[PDB]
Design an enzyme around this catalytic site. Structure first.
Site, short mmCIF file in Angstrom:
data_model
loop_
_atom_site.label_atom_id
_atom_site.label_comp_id
_atom_site.label_asym_id
_atom_site.label_seq_id
_atom_site.Cartn_x
_atom_site.Cartn_y
_atom_site.Cartn_z
N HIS A 39 0.76 -1.19 0.01
CA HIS A 39 0.29 -0.06 0.11
C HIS A 39 1.07 1.36 -0.15
O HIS A 39 0.37 2.38 -0.26
CB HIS A 39 -0.60 -0.54 1.39
CG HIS A 39 0.20 0.07 2.20
ND1 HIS A 39 -0.68 -1.55 3.49
CD2 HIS A 39 0.07 0.80 3.04
CE1 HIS A 39 0.28 -1.09 4.64
NE2 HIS A 39 0.16 0.41 4.50
N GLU A 70 0.97 -8.81 -0.11
CA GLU A 70 0.59 -7.18 0.22
C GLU A 70 2.42 -7.20 0.53
O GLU A 70 2.43 -5.92 1.32
CB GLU A 70 -0.21 -7.38 1.66
CG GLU A 70 0.22 -5.82 2.40
CD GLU A 70 -0.72 -4.58 0.79
OE1 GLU A 70 -1.71 -5.68 0.04
OE2 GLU A 70 -1.18 -3.36 1.31
N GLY A 144 1.29 4.57 12.59
CA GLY A 144 2.45 4.40 11.64
C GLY A 144 3.45 3.55 11.45
O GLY A 144 5.01 3.25 10.87
N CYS A 146 3.84 0.90 9.54
CA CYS A 146 3.65 -0.27 7.77
C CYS A 146 5.40 -0.27 7.56
O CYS A 146 5.28 0.90 7.69
CB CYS A 146 2.92 0.24 7.23
SG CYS A 146 0.80 -0.24 8.09
#
Length: 179
Positions: A39, A70, A144, A146
């Site tokens: 993403h 992902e 935050g 990720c």
């Protein structure tokens, strides 16, 4: 001992990356190849530790059916090679009793979180997208993290890719993704 391991791994192989979609932790794997959550949607250039870096190639990983994993692999235009950490990646999803999640961002500078037990959770509908090879842990809150790197002593397990407010999920980092 997993904290000491984690600190050394982040110092040698991690960086902070900004794309048009946000700020992430990025983990270098070997040569000029690194990984981000899908993403993050890196474009032709990224900001890596505030420096403009060109992306030579990018690959959004899927399984043999085309199902989302992902993960985006990106090959970077830079002179220095990453320390090869493929020996720390398992061939298949790893469950452990104790893991550490490590974050490297402006919002979460050099933070380490003991997350406890990691399970091979399987499929998750993540953001509307059926996703496989998820690793789950107890994890309050979001924001935050990720790109955070999930580790146990001597193992790199996965990349943090999302959460539900209570549980966190990492994409398993498997050896075969990288040769």
């Amino acid at each position: 001992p997993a904290f000491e391991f984690a600190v050394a791994m982040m110092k040698r192989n991690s960086s902070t990356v900004k794309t048009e979609y946000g700020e992430f932790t990025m983990l270098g794997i070997y040569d000029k190849w690194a990984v981000l959550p899908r993403h993050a949607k890196p474009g032709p250039t990224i900001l890596m530790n505030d420096q403009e870096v060109s992306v030579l190639d990018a690959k959004e990983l899927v399984d043999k059916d085309g199902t989302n994993l992902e993960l985006t692999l990106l090959k970077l235009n830079r002179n220095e090679k990453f320390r090869d950490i493929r020996g720390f990646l398992a061939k298949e999803e790893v469950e452990v009793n104790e893991a550490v999640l490590a974050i490297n961002t402006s919002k979460f500078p050099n933070m380490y979180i003991p997350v406890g037990q990691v399970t091979d959770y399987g499929f998750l509908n993540l953001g509307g997208t059926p996703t496989k090879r998820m690793l789950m842990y107890n994890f309050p809150t979001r924001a935050g993290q990720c790109g955070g790197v999930l580790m146990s002593t001597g193992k790199v397990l996965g990349i943090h890719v999302g959460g539900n407010g209570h549980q966190g999920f990492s994409a398993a980092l498997l050896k075969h993704y990288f040769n």
